[PDB]
């Protein structure tokens, strides 16, 4: 969970806490992942559905080519 500054990101801008556009620093806390389990599970289901649809299309293509072969 560490990042570095690249060409596209730009250059690191150093600063203090609660100064300018920077935020604040709180002791006694930690940050959790910024994910929502409901959304992740729904997206998982949708991705599975899309994968099944694409597999069906690929099977259709293969069946068509094999039907051409048996002539």
């Amino acid at each position: 969970t560490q990042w570095d500054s690249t060409q596209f990101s730009g250059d690191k801008i150093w600063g203090e806490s609660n100064k300018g556009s920077f935020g604040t620093i709180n002791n006694g806390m930690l940050e959790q992942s910024n994910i929502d389990m409901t959304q992740e599970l729904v997206d998982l289901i949708s991705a599975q559905r899309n994968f099944q649809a694409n597999s069906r299309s690929l099977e259709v293509h293969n069946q068509l080519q094999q039907n051409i072969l048996q002539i």
Binding site: T1, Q2, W3, D4, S5, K12, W14, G15, E16, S17, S21, F22, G23, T24, I25, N26, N27, G28, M29, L30, E31, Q32, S33, N34, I35, M37, E40, D43, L44, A47, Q48, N50, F51, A53, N54, S55, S57, L58, H61, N62, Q65
Partner: protein, 145 residues
């Protein structure tokens, strides 16, 4: 069939992204990823266009959505959290503060040398303030002792 293969690849990439997001549900400071795709089409000099179908789907980028996550309370003052915009700076070695990386988790503790380090014993970069003046004199990052 290559269009179907591209669709399969895109679906599997999204599946992997979702699996990684679910796996990192407990990692401190983690930021989720979003998979974004784009259309594919040829650009031949002599293209029928009206009589030419698509070219499948190609992955554009994997996002790094940086929206603020939830916060847990541990009552351990050595744990720190950045509320808003900002990242912690940590250096691999004490003697090379220039070589540093950005992070968000605040699981800090004193090492054997009384320096604040992360879980991987990476020193935390900090400023040096004046004895009386609150403003920091030198903005160069140095390990905190």
């Amino acid at each position: 069939s290559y269009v179907s293969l591209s669709g399969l690849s895109a679906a599997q990439l999204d599946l992997n992204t979702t699996s990684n997001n679910i796996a990192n549900a407990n990692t401190y400071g983690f930021k989720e990823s979003r998979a974004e795709f784009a259309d594919v089409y040829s650009n031949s000099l002599f293209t029928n266009a009206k009589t030419t179908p698509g070219g499948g789907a190609q992955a554009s980028q994997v996002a790094q959505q940086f929206h603020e996550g939830s916060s847990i309370y541990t009552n351990n003052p050595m744990d720190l959290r950045v509320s808003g915009t900002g990242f912690f700076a940590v250096a691999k070695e004490r003697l090379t503060p220039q070589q540093n990386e950005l992070t968000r988790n605040g699981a800090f503790h004193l090492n054997k040398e009384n320096y604040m380090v992360t879980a991987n014993d990476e020193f935390l970069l900090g400023y040096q303030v004046d004895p009386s003046s609150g403003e920091v004199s030198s903005y160069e990052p140095q390990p905190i002792n």
